Write a protein that holds these residues in place. Structure first.
Motif, PDB file in Angstrom:
ATOM      1  N   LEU F  10      24.377  39.039 -42.693  1.00  0.00           N
ATOM      2  CA  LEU F  10      25.079  39.180 -41.630  1.00  0.00           C
ATOM      3  C   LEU F  10      25.131  40.663 -40.272  1.00  0.00           C
ATOM      4  O   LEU F  10      24.266  40.881 -39.374  1.00  0.00           O
ATOM      5  N   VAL F  11      26.123  41.103 -41.046  1.00  0.00           N
ATOM      6  CA  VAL F  11      26.499  42.013 -40.081  1.00  0.00           C
ATOM      7  C   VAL F  11      25.559  43.436 -40.700  1.00  0.00           C
ATOM      8  O   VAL F  11      24.945  44.143 -39.398  1.00  0.00           O
ATOM      9  N   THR F  12      24.317  43.591 -41.350  1.00  0.00           N
ATOM     10  CA  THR F  12      23.314  44.294 -41.483  1.00  0.00           C
ATOM     11  C   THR F  12      22.098  43.386 -41.971  1.00  0.00           C
ATOM     12  O   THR F  12      21.936  42.355 -43.013  1.00  0.00           O
ATOM     13  N   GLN F  13      21.342  43.416 -41.292  1.00  0.00           N
ATOM     14  CA  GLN F  13      20.647  42.578 -41.164  1.00  0.00           C
ATOM     15  C   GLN F  13      19.248  42.799 -42.107  1.00  0.00           C
ATOM     16  O   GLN F  13      17.881  42.714 -41.731  1.00  0.00           O
ATOM     17  N   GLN F  14      20.041  42.982 -42.768  1.00  0.00           N
ATOM     18  CA  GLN F  14      18.989  42.762 -44.077  1.00  0.00           C
ATOM     19  C   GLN F  14      18.399  41.474 -45.140  1.00  0.00           C
ATOM     20  O   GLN F  14      19.543  41.282 -45.221  1.00  0.00           O
ATOM     21  N   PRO F  15      17.790  41.318 -46.096  1.00  0.00           N
ATOM     22  CA  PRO F  15      17.240  40.624 -46.780  1.00  0.00           C
ATOM     23  C   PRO F  15      18.160  40.365 -47.565  1.00  0.00           C
ATOM     24  O   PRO F  15      18.878  41.543 -48.061  1.00  0.00           O
ATOM     25  N   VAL F  55      14.549  44.173 -36.280  1.00  0.00           N
ATOM     26  CA  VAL F  55      14.547  43.028 -36.583  1.00  0.00           C
ATOM     27  C   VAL F  55      13.925  42.185 -35.111  1.00  0.00           C
ATOM     28  O   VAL F  55      13.410  40.630 -35.809  1.00  0.00           O
ATOM     29  N   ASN F  56      13.403  42.914 -34.599  1.00  0.00           N
ATOM     30  CA  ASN F  56      12.295  42.529 -33.397  1.00  0.00           C
ATOM     31  C   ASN F  56      11.043  43.083 -33.850  1.00  0.00           C
ATOM     32  O   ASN F  56       9.859  42.888 -33.273  1.00  0.00           O
ATOM     33  N   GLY F  57      10.654  44.080 -34.767  1.00  0.00           N
ATOM     34  CA  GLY F  57      10.104  43.737 -35.615  1.00  0.00           C
ATOM     35  C   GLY F  57       9.391  43.437 -36.712  1.00  0.00           C
ATOM     36  O   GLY F  57       7.687  43.289 -36.567  1.00  0.00           O
ATOM     37  N   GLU F  78      17.779  49.041 -37.879  1.00  0.00           N
ATOM     38  CA  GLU F  78      19.480  48.434 -37.685  1.00  0.00           C
ATOM     39  C   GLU F  78      20.753  49.006 -38.175  1.00  0.00           C
ATOM     40  O   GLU F  78      21.593  49.428 -37.413  1.00  0.00           O
ATOM     41  N   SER F  79      20.345  49.901 -39.352  1.00  0.00           N
ATOM     42  CA  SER F  79      21.239  50.214 -39.768  1.00  0.00           C
ATOM     43  C   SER F  79      21.577  51.122 -39.225  1.00  0.00           C
ATOM     44  O   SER F  79      22.699  51.955 -39.321  1.00  0.00           O
ATOM     45  N   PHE F  80      20.726  52.129 -38.620  1.00  0.00           N
ATOM     46  CA  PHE F  80      20.950  53.187 -37.583  1.00  0.00           C
ATOM     47  C   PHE F  80      22.082  53.611 -36.537  1.00  0.00           C
ATOM     48  O   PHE F  80      22.392  54.002 -36.467  1.00  0.00           O
ATOM     49  N   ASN F  81      21.007  52.114 -35.997  1.00  0.00           N
ATOM     50  CA  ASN F  81      21.903  51.809 -34.886  1.00  0.00           C
ATOM     51  C   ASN F  81      23.607  51.564 -35.318  1.00  0.00           C
ATOM     52  O   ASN F  81      25.028  52.492 -34.151  1.00  0.00           O
ATOM     53  N   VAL F  82      23.623  51.013 -36.177  1.00  0.00           N
ATOM     54  CA  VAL F  82      25.134  50.000 -36.653  1.00  0.00           C
ATOM     55  C   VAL F  82      26.076  52.036 -36.827  1.00  0.00           C
ATOM     56  O   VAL F  82      27.018  52.487 -36.772  1.00  0.00           O
ATOM     57  N   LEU F  83      25.086  52.140 -37.135  1.00  0.00           N
ATOM     58  CA  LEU F  83      25.962  54.346 -37.656  1.00  0.00           C
ATOM     59  C   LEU F  83      26.151  54.883 -36.602  1.00  0.00           C
ATOM     60  O   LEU F  83      27.099  55.350 -36.603  1.00  0.00           O
TER      61      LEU F  83
END
Ligand SMILES: [Mg+2]
Ligand SMILES: [Zn+2]
Ligand SMILES: [Zn+2]
Lengths: 49, 50, 75, 58, 1336, 98
Positions: F10-15, F55-57, F78-83
């Motif tokens: 959820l928070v980080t869009q990883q498998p 997410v969109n790639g 996404e992790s870099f955007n969250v960072l």
């Protein structure tokens, strides 16, 4: 466990590092066949809709 | 029934499995002799003696 | 096929430029729409590109010259 | 002075124990321990209770 | 897309610009309808709608009208993901200090204001006031005024007096501060008088003021006025199954901050007593501090679970932060894992993949194929087809898999061979079949291990897997050149049994027509696999420019060798297979094949070797029984004799004839000797057998015993394991490290009793624990090594430099343990290799030394070459291919772009877990003396007159074979220029007392010697001689303390004898504690002894040798060449002064008197010589001796640790790490450059700065190179994104923000975090093109 | 255990992780070093972005694969955007200069 008739010899690389070569009659006689019982639950709840 | 690799025994110095294998061979030999005497319908005297 | 890639490296010269050129040619031949210069034995586009590079029928200069000629034709 | 001796011992040994630091020295103790670990320099070597409730009581 | 990242401080205007609205209430969601509240932390107005294209009320709930703001709710109709991107803000009632800029170690706020941190803290907590620009009213700016002092100062001052308290005072101070004028004032101060630290502190102050002025920030931005609010979806309040919820800790912290802020705002309207507002403001500061960083200033706020809450800072740092847990390694799609089995039928380039795993991993490919071929109409039909697993689905899957590599990986990835690409072969079952020959690369056994499988997706990824990572491309180790595809244990046993002759076997003496007839005879039962026969063999030789000329001849071999010859490729000789073929012969065979023929023949040859070995190991039927472990027949006698000897020793000790500390050693030696005898008897009985015969006579031959065969071939085991199986278990240790005296006298064929087994358990437990600890340490070392040297890349073809290292064989006193071939193979010569006869050039220059050149050098017997090295490369920001050498894994000169730093780190760290008098010559050669002054003693022989004498044994071929070190003053039987025979002790000396000796002969007089001032009366009672013992300075009286004992040499004519060849008087100032034996007036022969002066390992050695630690007692080197002299004495430590021949002598060192100096004050020494004796320091060598000497000390001092354990790695990989150690230069003279005198700058920058400047009409700057450790040298990174990854995140972000730093992604660790191609390998071209267009 | 695509965190869009959740395989730092030792820049990039949390790639990659076209548009994880958002949630101003 079970009492198996074993021989200590290489036999063609199918027991190379720690592999084991097993006969097909150990599988016909169901000597290492085990029964596993597992539970599955289906909970129904009262949702908002 | 099973074929195991002898190269596993020298490095892992657990030679109790070889002694177990020899003694299991002996035990199964005694059992096979009893089984042979039992199939041939031999009287209880020789069975008891063996 | 192509259990080893050693002749193609000798033809191109560099191990990384080989990958880049082969990928360019394979993308030409897969999605762009092109015919291989060598017979295909059910080979994927990557392997066909590798063997073309090996036989000397493709390299970076060849691809650039061909693209220039094609753009001249389209114009 | 007292801190200097503890610093010298820590530099000689590269590590210190809780008892040694506490003797040679709650929030003030924690702050002093944090300052001591700074070196593992000049600012820490040169260097009330910080509890908002104790100051209110005072 | 951006190409750079910039970091700075945020103004309140900037923070208001980010936000979409202000959070006013601490509410999150309604407890009944579960909808976001209004103006709360989760607000639809501020942060966006909760579901795609739908207002909160529902009046607008369609895409058709998007971008409209509903009037009832105010919620914009857009996508819900926008809740993941929008921030809010909270306007604090009163300013709050930022904890990062307050409680940082430098304390940026205090540093900028020049105030102690305690003053700032006490003003913050409303303890004392502070005067802000008080004025001309007798007040000093930044003055502490406690409440009483402030109150009494307010009186008698009708002026405002400008005193404030709390963070508002700090903000007023910062805003009033002017930086340019204060910088000017500090410049004025620096211009005037300078002190030891005054100049340093003023320079620091001006420099940091300049940095803050240039960063573009303003100081008052360190005091918070507006607080940003994180987007809701990064701190979610999520429903779990049932009525339960789960929430992030940030919601609690934000709620506390907002509650206290609103309470303060309410309180400031009631006009409450100042006590209450002060307490409220302290609480607000505490809450904001806890939010930004919890548990740093005070006690960490905890939650209901009684655990410390996670703050914003805690979400970035640590091993569980965004920087490490998610940005450098994360879970991946299109992946699987499973248990591995053998699959010995495979080829080296393919693996076995289960059909089920293959079906799951390649699902999109199968959908595409099904739609393309028309089997399925839409993607749903394809999904259903694959879900039912129809028949066509498996044909489609087989078509998809055809040529599509998959990467297999095993969890402890220690080197790059832990990931390899194979081609799948679809199999039944659920286990992955792994080719045997690759197991050693993975370190994988088949007793329960698991492997992960990934599938490349793009065309570029598939081509990289096929061309870079395939298993048939990596057959050589990258640490050295040796193959890593050697057959392991059962192939070796099969090939050993096949090629192993027997004395009188069936079909012996036959004459075959070739290998085919040998196989036809063996297979039909007419001959034995080892029967000595004569076979006609046809072998090809490349005795030409690659022509393969044939030769046929009748060899004398066995049937097994003739059969094995069928698989050997053309170019190899027949002598490779004509032997017993142990473990190492097979590796030599594969290496020969690779070097002579190439890559493909080697792969084919390896597969054939594996197949043949497995087949014939099965054929032999070799087993293991209990009769194979033959115990010696004399074991009981040996043990009884040892028991008798030890009992005799014990009873002798009981009589008080020997100390226990010696009887212990005697018993230990007795038992060691008995153990050696038992092992020797066992091995003698077990390694030979009697057979008969061609005619009928007893004949010995090597045993066919199974245990001996397994140990001898290298398949498995050793002599130690056999010793424990059939000898005696040996000598056990104790928890204290001691060795228990009585050993285990039983083997495993016999049983151990309870006590012996108890001791064995003592040993085994410790073994397991030590293994765990070693695995723990070897990973940390590798991580540091990668961090320091990650960004090194080959980025040039030739720098053109003419310098390099001087490679010569390594000799530890006696034999040579590393020839020149190992150290020189694969490098580039830096100068012409002149023939040892000095005739012509043997190897011109810039020639990669491959096997042929090494053979040529060996033939001409040269023992010194000059090879280009990485540590002396002229390339800026990287290395050139010629100064590196060759790949060591491909076999050719290294390619441009290859990342050599990571390879060096991995190669050094991979073997970490494994690792834990008189001189007698030995060969008939000639003595050669280097660096020694000779003279003839009274006896007429030659005595050494030097401290660094070296003896070499130059044989008739002119090659050094034995290098020995001789101390000062040793009698030599022979000398230079005279041939000697073997077994001649050419030197001897006394290793006791002191080597103090004279140089001339003549009458000796006690010049400047007074009894009772420098000597004591101690007559030799035993001999009756009178000896004057020189006391120390302390004991002796002050009447003649400054005097020293000088023994001048005179003749019978009353004249003075001076040093021959010079006019310098011959006096010997003897030191204290010197026993003068000979009386005055007694002639002495040359060299007479005037005075009889009395007197790690394993991984941690490597780790402390890359950290450049300084040893405990570093041997003192000669700082400067010149005559040694002394000054004021006993000033804590003895003082020594060296006076150059002409140059000034500003050098003086407080040498401790404890160190036993090896130089007299009348003996000149050049720089780099040893004054004291002891371990050397790494930093001193670099300063006294050039860069090529410190690197030589390292690449030889850490290679010793690895050589002891049998690990071999190339020297290339240690010079790559060293190059990163000595990378900073310290400037000594600014010159015409723009460099400060005492400054540390990157050596690459200074090198190019003066280079271009010198080319112009200016003069360059001098410097001195500096050496750091791998942990201190990795902190000098110039990017704050790679630095924050492995350093302290709080420190790196705090300093980078004030400095207004911006970093352009240029490393390998930064493009991984950002998510773009690394600049190393296949992405090297992409980055170069980007720089080219950007420059335009 | 095998995975092609599934559910994401959820928070980080990883498998997600584990066999029970049908999760993916953790691709750690040592494997990144191993891929850097080779010049496998494209494999590393596709494992860092398209396969994990772009997410969109990743949907574009899936559509390209089921369209017979093996080409990716990598994008930013996404992790870099969250960072970036977390570093910015402090007083710091970290931006992406063009
Ligand atoms: Mg294992
Ligand atoms: Zn609305
Ligand atoms: Zn160079």
């Amino acid at each position: 466990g079970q009492n198996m008739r074993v021989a200590f010899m290489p036999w063609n690389g199918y027991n190379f590092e720690d592999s084991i070569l097993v006969s097909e009659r150990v599988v016909q006689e169901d000597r290492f066949t085990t029964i596993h019982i597992q539970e599955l639950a289906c909970v129904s709840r009262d949702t908002k809709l | 029934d099973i074929v195991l690799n002898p190269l596993g025994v020298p490095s892992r110095m657990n030679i109790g499995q070889i002694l177990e294998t020899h003694l299991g061979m002996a035990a199964k030999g005694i059992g096979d002799k009893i089984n042979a005497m039992l199939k041939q319908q031999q009287e209880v005297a020789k069975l008891r003696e063996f | 096929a192509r259990v080893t890639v050693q002749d193609a490296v000798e033809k191109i010269g560099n191990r990384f430029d080989l990958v880049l050129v082969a990928a360019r040619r394979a993308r030409q031949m897969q999605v762009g729409g092109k015919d291989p210069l060598v017979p295909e034995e059910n080979d994927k586009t990557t392997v066909i590109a590798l063997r073309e590079i090996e036989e000397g029928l493709i390299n970076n200069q060849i691809l650039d010259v061909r693209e220039r000629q094609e753009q001249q034709e389209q114009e | 002075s007292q801190l200097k001796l503890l610093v010298t011992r820590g530099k000689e040994q590269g590590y210190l124990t809780y008892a040694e630091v506490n003797d040679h020295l709650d929030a003030d103790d924690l702050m002093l321990a944090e300052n001591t670990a700074d070196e593992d320099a000049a600012e820490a070597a040169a260097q009330r209770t910080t509890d908002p409730v104790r100051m209110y009581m005072r | 897309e951006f190409d750079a990242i910039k970091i700075a401080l945020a103004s309140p205007d900037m923070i208001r610009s980010w936000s979409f609205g202000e959070v006013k209430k601490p509410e999150t969601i309604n407890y009944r309808t579960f909808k976001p509240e209004r103006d709360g932390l989760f607000c639809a107005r501020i942060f966006g709608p909760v579901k795609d294209y739908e207002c909160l009320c529902g009046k607008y709930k369609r895409l058709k009208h998007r971008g409209v703001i509903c009037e009832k709710c105010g919620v914009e109709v857009t996508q819900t993901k926008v809740r993941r991107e929008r921030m809010g803000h909270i306007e604090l009632a009163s300013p709050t200090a930022h904890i990062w800029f307050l409680k940082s170690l430098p304390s940026r706020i205090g540093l900028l204001l020049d105030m102690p941190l305690r003053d700032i803290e006490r003003v913050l907590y409303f303890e004392s006031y502070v005067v802000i620009e008080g004025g001309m009213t007798n007040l000093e700016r930044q003055q502490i005024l406690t409440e009483e002092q402030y109150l009494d100062a307010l009186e008698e001052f009708g002026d405002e007096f400008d005193a404030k308290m709390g963070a508002e005072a700090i903000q007023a101070l910062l805003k009033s501060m002017d930086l340019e004028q204060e910088c000017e004032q500090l410049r004025e101060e620096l211009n005037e008088t300078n002190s030891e630290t005054k100049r340093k502190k003023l320079t620091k102050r001006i420099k940091l003021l300049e940095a803050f002025v240039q960063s573009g920030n303003k100081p008052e931005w360190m005091i918070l006025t507006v607080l940003p609010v994180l987007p809701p979806d990064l701190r979610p309040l999520v429903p779990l199954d049932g009525g339960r919820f789960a929430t992030s800790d940030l919601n609690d912290l934000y709620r506390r901050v907002i509650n206290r802020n609103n309470r303060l705002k309410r309180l400031l309207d009631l006009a409450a007593p100042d006590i209450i507002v002060r307490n409220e403001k302290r609480m607000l500061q505490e809450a904001v501090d806890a939010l930004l960083d919890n548990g740093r200033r005070g006690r960490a706020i905890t939650g209901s679970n009684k655990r410390p809450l996670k703050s914003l800072a805690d979400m970035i740092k640590g091993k569980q932060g965004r920087f490490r847990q998610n940005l450098l390694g994360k879970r991946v799609d299109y992946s699987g894992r499973s248990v591995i089995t053998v699959g010995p039928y495979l080829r080296l380039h393919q693996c076995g993949l289960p059909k089920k795993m293959a079906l799951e991993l390649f699902k999109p490919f199968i959908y595409g194929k099904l739609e393309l071929r028309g089997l399925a109409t839409t993607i749903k039909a394809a999904k259903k087809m694959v879900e039912r697993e129809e028949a066509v689905v498996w044909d489609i899957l087989d078509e998809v898999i055809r040529e599509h590599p998959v990467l297999l990986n095993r969890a402890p990835t220690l080197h790059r061979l832990g990931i390899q690409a194979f081609e799948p072969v679809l199999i039944e079952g659920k286990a992955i079949q792994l080719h045997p020959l690759v197991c050693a690369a993975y370190n994988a056994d088949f007793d329960g291990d698991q492997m992960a499988v990934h599938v490349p997706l793009t065309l570029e990824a598939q081509l990289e897997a096929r061309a870079l990572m395939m298993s048939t491309n990596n057959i050589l180790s990258p640490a050295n050149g040796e193959p890593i595809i050697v057959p392991s244990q059962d192939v070796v046993l099969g090939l050993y049994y096949m090629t192993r002759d027997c004395v009188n076997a069936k079909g012996e003496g036959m004459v075959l027509t070739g290998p085919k007839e040998a196989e036809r005879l063996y297979r039909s039962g007419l001959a034995s696999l080892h029967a000595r026969v004569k076979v006609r063999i046809t072998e090809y030789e490349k005795d030409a420019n690659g022509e393969l000329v044939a030769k046929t001849s009748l060899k004398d071999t066995t049937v097994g060798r003739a059969i094995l010859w069928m698989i050997v490729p053309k170019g190899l000789p027949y002598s490779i297979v004509n032997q017993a073929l142990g473990k190492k012969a097979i590796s030599k065979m594969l290496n020969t094949c690779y070097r002579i023929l190439g890559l493909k023949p080697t792969v084919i040859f390896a597969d054939q070797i594996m197949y043949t070995g497995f087949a014939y190991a099965a054929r032999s039927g070799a087993s293991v029984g209990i009769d194979d472990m033959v115990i010696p027949e004399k074991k009981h006698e040996i043990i009884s004799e040892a028991e008798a000897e030890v009992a005799e020793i014990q009873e002798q000790f009981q009589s008080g004839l020997v100390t226990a500390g010696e009887r212990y050693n005697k018993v230990i030696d007795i038992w060691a000797a008995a153990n050696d005898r038992v092992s020797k008897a066992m091995m003698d009985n077990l390694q030979t057998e009697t057979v008969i015969n061609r005619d009928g006579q007893e004949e010995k031959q090597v045993s066919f015993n199974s245990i001996y065969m397994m140990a001898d071939s290298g398949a498995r085991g050793s002599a130690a394991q056999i010793r424990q199986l059939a000898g005696m278990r040996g000598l056990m240790a104790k928890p204290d490290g001691s060795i228990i005296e009585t050993p285990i006298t039983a083997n495993f064929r016999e049983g151990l009793n309870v006590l012996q087994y108890f001791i064995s358990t003592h040993g085994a437990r410790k073994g397991l624990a030590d293994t765990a600890l070693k695995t723990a340490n070897s990973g940390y070392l590798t991580r540091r090594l990668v961090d320091v040297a990650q960004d090194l890349v080959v980025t040039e073809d030739d720098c053109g430099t003419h310098e390099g290292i001087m490679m010569t064989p390594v000799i530890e006193g006696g034999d040579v343990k590393e020839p020149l071939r190992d150290r020189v193979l694969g490098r580039v010569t830096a100068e012409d290799v002149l023939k040892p006869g000095t005739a012509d050039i043997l190897v011109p220059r810039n020639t990669l030394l491959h096997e042929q050149w090494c053979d040529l050098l060996e033939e001409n017997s040269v023992d010194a070459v000059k090879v280009r090295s990485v540590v002396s490369c002229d390339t800026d920001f990287g290395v050139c291919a010629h100064c590196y050498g060759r790949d060591l894994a491909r076999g050719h000169i290294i390619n441009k772009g290859e990342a050599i730093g990571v390879i060096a780190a991995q190669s050094i760290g991979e073997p970490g877990t494994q690792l834990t008098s008189s001189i007698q010559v030995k060969n008939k050669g000639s003595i050669k003396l280097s660096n020694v002054k000779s003279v003839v003693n009274s006896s007429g022989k030659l005595v050494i007159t030097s401290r660094n004498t070296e003896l070499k044994l130059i044989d008739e071929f002119g090659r050094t074979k034995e290098s020995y070190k001789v101390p000062y003053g040793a009698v030599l039987a022979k000398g230079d220029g005279e041939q000697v025979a073997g077994g001649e002790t050419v030197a001897n000396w006394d290793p006791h007392t002191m080597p103090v000796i004279t140089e001339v002969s003549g009458f000796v007089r006690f010049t400047d010697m007074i009894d009772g001032q420098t000597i004591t009366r101690q007559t030799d009672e035993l001999t009756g001689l009178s000896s004057l013992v020189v006391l120390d300075s302390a004991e002796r009286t002050a009447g003649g303390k400054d005097l020293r004992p000088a023994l001048k040499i005179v003749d019978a004519q009353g004249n003075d004898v001076l040093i021959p060849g010079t006019d310098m008087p011959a006096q010997y100032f003897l030191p204290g504690k010197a026993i003068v034996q000979l009386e005055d007036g007694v002639q002495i022969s040359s060299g007479d002894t005037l005075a009889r002066i009395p007197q790690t390992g394993g991984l941690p050695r490597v780790a402390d040798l890359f950290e450049a630690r300084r040893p405990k007692e570093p041997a003192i080197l000669a700082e400067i060449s010149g005559i040694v002299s002394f000054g004021k004495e006993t000033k804590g430590k003895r003082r020594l002064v060296i006076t150059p021949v002409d140059g000034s002598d500003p050098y003086e060192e407080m040498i401790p008197k404890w160190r036993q100096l090896n130089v007299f004050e009348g003996e000149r020494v050049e720089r780099g010589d040893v004054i004291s004796d002891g371990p050397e320091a790494p930093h001193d060598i670099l300063r006294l001796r050039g860069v090529h000497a410190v690197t030589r000390y390292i690449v030889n001092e850490v290679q010793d640790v690895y050589r002891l354990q049998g690990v071999k790695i190339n020297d290339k990989h240690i010079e790559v790490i060293v190059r990163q150690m000595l990378r900073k230069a310290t400037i000594v003279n600014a010159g015409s450059s723009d460099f400060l005198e005492g400054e540390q700058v990157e050596y690459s920058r200074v090198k190019i700065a003066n280079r271009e400047l010198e080319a112009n009409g200016k003069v360059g700057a001098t410097y001195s190179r500096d050496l750091l450790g791998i942990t201190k040298a990795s902190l000098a990174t110039e990017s704050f994104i790679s630095a924050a990854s492995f350093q302290e995140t709080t420190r790196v972000l705090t300093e980078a923000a004030v400095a207004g730093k911006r970093d352009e992604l240029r490393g390998l660790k930064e493009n991984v975090i950002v998510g773009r191609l690394i600049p190393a390998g296949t992405g090297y071209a992409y980055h170069q093109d980007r720089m080219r267009r950007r420059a335009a | 255990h095998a995975r092609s695509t599934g559910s994401y965190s959820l928070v980080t869009q990883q498998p997600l992780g584990g066999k029970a959740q049908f999760g993916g395989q953790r691709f750690g730092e040592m494997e990144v070093w191993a891929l850097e030792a080779y010049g496998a820049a494209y494999t590393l990039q596709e494992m860092l972005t398209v396969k994990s949390d772009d997410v969109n790639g990743r949907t574009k990659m899936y559509k390209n694969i089921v369209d017979g076209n093996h080409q990716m548009e990598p994008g930013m994880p996404e992790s870099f955007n969250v960072l970036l958002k977390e570093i910015r949630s402090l007083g710091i101003n970290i931006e992406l200069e063009d």
